[PDB]
Amino acid sequence: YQLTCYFTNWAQYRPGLGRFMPDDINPCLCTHLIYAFAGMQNNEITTIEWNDVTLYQAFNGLKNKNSQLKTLLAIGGWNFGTAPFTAMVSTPENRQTFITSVIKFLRQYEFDGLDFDWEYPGSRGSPPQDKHLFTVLVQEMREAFEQEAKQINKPRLMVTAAVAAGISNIQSGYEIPQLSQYLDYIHVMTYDLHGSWEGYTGENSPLYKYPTDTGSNAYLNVDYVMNYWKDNGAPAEKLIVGFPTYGHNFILSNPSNTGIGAPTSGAGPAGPYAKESGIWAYYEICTFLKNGATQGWDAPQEVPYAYQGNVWVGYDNVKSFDIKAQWLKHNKFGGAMVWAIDLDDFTGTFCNQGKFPLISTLKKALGLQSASCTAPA
C-alpha cells in the first residue's frame, strides 16, 4: 500500500507549535510526499511562496534519508480556481508550453512527479469541454514523461491527480476509464463531505452513510465515493483513499441538540494555530477535548465528534483511521493519502498519542512499520 502525505507551504506561517517546515517531516513516515502548492504564469508552472525554492530543497532533501521516498509537486488548489487551467488546456500550443515547463521545473528542483489539483474540470467556472481536455492534458503529459525518461536515462516522472468526491463534480469533471489509463495514482478527496455550508451538523469524512442520509446525501461517504470511482472505470490498485487530519466545526443553533443533523447557524470558531474558520487541525481538536469537550461517537459512520457549549466538531481520530484502514485493505485499494501532514499532532504535545498519531496509525495498519528506511548510497 501507498501512504501519500500532503505538505502545505503556508503551514510555515502558523504561530508557535503550529509552525511546520519540510524538516519537521519524518522521512520514514510516508511513502510519497506531495508539496502543495505550485502556481501558474503564462501557461508555465511557477512558485507561490517567496521561499518555495529553499523549501523544495529541504523537502526533496528528505529523500537523502529514505531511499524509497518519492516526492511530488501539486499544482492548483481551491484558491487557485479553474481559470488558469482552462486557458492552458484550451489550445495544444499552451498544453505543450505547460508540459515543457513542468518537465524542466520538476527535474531542476528534484521532484519525482506532478500532482494535478484542478478543482474542478467542468465546474466552478470551468466550461464543459474541460472534462475531455483534462484527459487530453494528462495523456499528453504522461506520454511526454515517458519519452523524456528515455532521452535522459532516468526514472519516469509520475503524473497523479487529486479528484472530486462529489458525484455531480465527478460526472461533469472526469472521463474515468480513459483518465485512469494515464494517471499513476488517483487521489480521491474523500473529505469535506459535510460542513457548515449545509446548515446542520455532519461528518467531514464519514466511512458509511448515516440512516437519515436520503437521496443524493447517501453518496456523501467514503465507501460510496471510492466504489463509485471503481465501478465507473478506475482500477482499485490506482485508487488512493483520502484521509483528513482535520475536522469541520459548527456553531450549534441549540446547544442542547448535539447529535448528527443538529441545526447550525454557521461555521465554528477558527483554531488558534491554523486560524481556519470552520476547520480545526487534529491537534486543535485535542485541545478542545482536553479543555472539557464531550466525546461523541457516530457509530453508523465509524467516526468521532465532539461538542461543548455551542461548538460542535466532526472529525477523525486514531480509532476511525484504523477502522478505515482495515476497510481499505478489505476493498484492496492502492493505499491512502493524507491531508495534511502539518495538521496531524506532529509534536505529540497536543494529543499525547505519540508523534504523528494519525499517520502512524495508517503506517502501522497498512503494513509499512518494517519498510526499509535507509539513506541512499
Ligand SMILES: N=C(N)N1CCN(c2ccc(Cl)cc2)CC1
Ligand atoms: N481541497 C479542498 N477543496 N479543501 C480541502 C482542504 N481544506 C483545508 C484548508 C485548511 C485546513 Cl487547516 C484544513 C483543510 C480546504 C478545502
